[PDB]
UniProtKB/Swiss-Prot annotation, chain A:
Changing residue 66 to E: Strong decrease in RT binding affinity for all dNTP substrates and in catalytic efficiency. 100-fold decreased sensitivity to ddNTP inhibitors. Changing residue 406 to L: No effect on RT p66/p51 heterodimerization. A motif (Tryptophan repeat motif) lies at residues 399-415. Multifunctional enzyme that converts the viral RNA genome into dsDNA in the cytoplasm, shortly after virus entry into the cell. This enzyme displays a DNA polymerase activity that can copy either DNA or RNA templates, and a ribonuclease H (RNase H) activity that cleaves the RNA strand of RNA-DNA heteroduplexes in a partially processive 3' to 5' endonucleasic mode. Conversion of viral genomic RNA into dsDNA requires many steps. A tRNA(3)-Lys binds to the primer-binding site (PBS) situated at the 5'-end of the viral RNA. Changing residue 157 to T: Complete loss of polymerase activity. No loss of RNase H activity. This is Reverse transcriptase/ribonuclease H. Changing residue 66 to Q: Strong decrease in RT binding affinity for all dNTP substrates and in catalytic efficiency. 100-fold decreased sensitivity to ddNTP inhibitors. Changing residue 186 to N: Strongly decreased RNA-directed and DNA-directed DNA polymerase activities. No effect on RNase H activity. Changing residue 227 to A: No effect on RNA-dependent DNA polymerase activity. Complete loss of RNA 5'-end cleavage. No effect on RNA 3'-end cleavage. Changing residue 411 to L: No effect on RT p66/p51 heterodimerization. It comes from Human immunodeficiency virus type 1 group M subtype B (isolate BH10). The chain holds residues 600 to 1153 of 1447 of the full protein. Residues 45-235 form the Reverse transcriptase domain. Changing residue 540 to D: Severely reduced exonuclease activity of RNase H, but no effect on endonucleonuclease activity.
Amino acid sequence: VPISPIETVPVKLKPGMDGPKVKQWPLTEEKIKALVEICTEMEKEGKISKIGPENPYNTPVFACKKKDSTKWRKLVDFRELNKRTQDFWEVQLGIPHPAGLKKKKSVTVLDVGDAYFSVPLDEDFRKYTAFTIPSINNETPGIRYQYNVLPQGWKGSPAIFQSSMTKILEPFKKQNPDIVIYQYMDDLYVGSDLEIGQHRTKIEELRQHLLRWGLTTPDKKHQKEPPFLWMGYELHPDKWTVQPIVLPEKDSWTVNDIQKLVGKLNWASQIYPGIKVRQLSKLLRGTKALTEVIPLTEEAELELAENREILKEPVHGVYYDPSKDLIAEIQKQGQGQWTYQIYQEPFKNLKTGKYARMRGAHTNDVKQLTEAVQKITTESIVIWGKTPKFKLPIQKETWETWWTEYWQATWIPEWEFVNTPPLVKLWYQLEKEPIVGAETFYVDGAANRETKLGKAGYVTNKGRQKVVPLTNTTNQKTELQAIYLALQDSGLEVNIVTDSQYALGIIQAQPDKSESELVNQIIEQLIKKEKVYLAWVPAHKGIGGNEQVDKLVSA
Amino acid sequence: IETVPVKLKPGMDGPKVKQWPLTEEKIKALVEICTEMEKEGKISKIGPENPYNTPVFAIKKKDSTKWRKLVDFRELNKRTQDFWPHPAGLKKKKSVTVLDVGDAYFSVPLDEDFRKYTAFTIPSINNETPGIRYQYNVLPQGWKGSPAIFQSSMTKILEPFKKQNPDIVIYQYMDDLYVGSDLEIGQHRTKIEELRQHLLRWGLTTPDKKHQKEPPFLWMGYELHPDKWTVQPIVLPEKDSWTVNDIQKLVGKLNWASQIYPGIKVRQLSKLLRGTKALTEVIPLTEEAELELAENREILKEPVHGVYYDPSKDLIAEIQKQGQGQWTYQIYQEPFKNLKTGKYARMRGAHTNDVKQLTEAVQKITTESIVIWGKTPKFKLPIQKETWETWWTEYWQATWIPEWEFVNTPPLVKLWY
DNA sequence: AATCGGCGCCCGAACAGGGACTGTG
DNA sequence: ACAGTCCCTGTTCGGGCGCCG
């Protein structure tokens, strides 16, 4: 099969650069003999040309086993040439998802054999792809070659092959507007509504079209029968699922092992509902030693047991129907953890997922719910090109009181309430007006910049005062510590007056969880209270108890 | 027609901005538009060996069903070379109409050495196919340099009409032509149609709207009336009885306002709270405090003196969500020296869509800055970055895009409404 | 493991940026 | 004014998962 007659893509080096001059490291005899057999084959096939001393460049070469195959893959460590190669704009903007596939009468999955090795490389750039194959006998010099086609391991190869495949498919795609061709790298999901007889006729027209352009679709890689193995999925005619997930079983684990467990559990969460990884990811905090052994905590092991429990049963997804509404439903599983399912008909999920990102030092469930609604919205636009209808565990009046009282602009698209506990609630609410008959606390705090020691106290209208000394603190922490004192030493109704915008903006946002231990202690007090009014006054303006407590903590 | 040489500003590369996901509604509109643009030679396909990209999306035109392709040329405009008097009466006119004349740019070819920087990528639903990339061969809508290169041709087209109607003010900013007059609303719209037909003799204007008479909330950015724009004064409460809490809020408000108004005093007011009293305690105002308050009311009623626009300094706009569909905004160049303070209310998504509101408010504030100063302000948006980026394109209808940043503001701006 | 490329997602952390407060005459 | 410290956000990179060459 001749090299593709498609025109090469002009490639340049970065301005003021030269080619790579990296010496070839020694190779094992098993790989040397495999590289020689491969190279003499692809010189006859034209993919490779011999070069002489005029070429002053080189790049180390090796060969790894092809993924689940007996053939060897020829790879080159073009890390030095990639640094000197011009930048590209990658045209692969995402990964196709089965949940976005519509129903089709006839489906075929193709695969181009020796894909990159079919597309030629720009003639002027070929000199920089020089490599050397070291022979067995060290007395023989070894044969130097250059690349005539897209090498594997060059940074431009994926983009150029992707661009080249689209130009090759364009005439066939225009000649047949009703045939769906999902193009990812060299694998072609071909789908039509024709009868099985007329479909195989068009597949052969497509295979002949690709054969004329030097793109072979080998019969060993030609799938004509469901189930289809496509993009790591199993494509049954009316359902889709992920290829078998293998969770490792070990008595002791290391960072690497947890990192693999986290990844596969994420990869499974697209269709397995309920995967949790928060406690498993918590073990990755601080330790950068890759081979360090980590004892599983009680929460992490419990979490792994839960994941394995829902992973022993197979789950399947459904394909997309453009005529029916898109529906997404979210549930609050753990603290900071959410799961969602996108479906059209109930109990027939297209795909599932999870959101468990902590945005900010202080946040509440309503914020996280709105963050998960946004993540689902974007994901739906990529897969289906439209926004789904939402089913959220939050009362209509709960959200209404939040977005009307919050200073930032927040919105959730068309959604309906589902009574699936645990519900999303506002655990406390600050009063809009000062409470009559409630002790007024004037709080402040200070700290030294060098000593890091500080004070925090309050004064009241009933004459009650307090000042607490603090060690290893900041100005921001003492004004938070002062509010904590007022909440501790008061009844169920209290008026608090602070001079700290920092402390005021945290409390007014109604957080229910925080990365700060001190804030969580303040939150616990606010939920216990019945009425809390928080007021702000400018510091150093001779106002009320603020002046009295400022002198108490500044001394 | 030979092309004008264009360079980037010294030491800067072209834009490299990823394309964001688009709805099927928008992708189908873009593909239809671009397929026709490639046929007429206005754009052409490119590959990944062009390392530049600029985001593209589509907007539905004002009171129309047709789609307009909008390129986010903000990054390219920062990096494009600068080329080489603002009508103060345009803001004084009764009626001002905004005409999208961006289609005229597609008749002037672009410098070949520059076209690589106008590359954009059309995405595909579910990533069925890789992105199909195009670059521009003609002057693109939304580019900083298009009105400058076309400036010579624009004065030539308008000179006959401006001498036939010398009482009409015509300002140009990017793709849009701002046409102002003091005529009555009906005679004004006929003059606009007269200008549209005069342009048709040379270049095509946006297809007319489905309505000839102003429909409710569909000509917001189209037919604007500057002589009715009002500034929002800072006000103080009027109570018969004042509490300690009420006086503390007042002093804090006045002390902050003292950064904008020099004569604001709070001494006699703070004396009323010299104890350590309860917030609900009623405090009678002494004779000294009543005068200081009454004088602060006067200072806040008079406009600020000595605040003038500096054409070299950027404009900055801050918006505050006041609730009940009401939004306050301030436009300034230096802190506490506001060039304008306004208020917006009763916007679409009535009582429901906060993001649609903020997106509309940003457009009207920008519109006002183009009419008044001929610039666009950098916006400090009171919204989460991802909340905004998810939804803002769904409510945008302007041909320009202002720069913005996102801020988490303390809720002590209770000083504007 | 040595020993490659491009894309997407996740989670943890290094680095930068910006605003408020405070300390200096 | 000017320079710090504190705290917070956002960007980028390190690891992993998956696709494919």
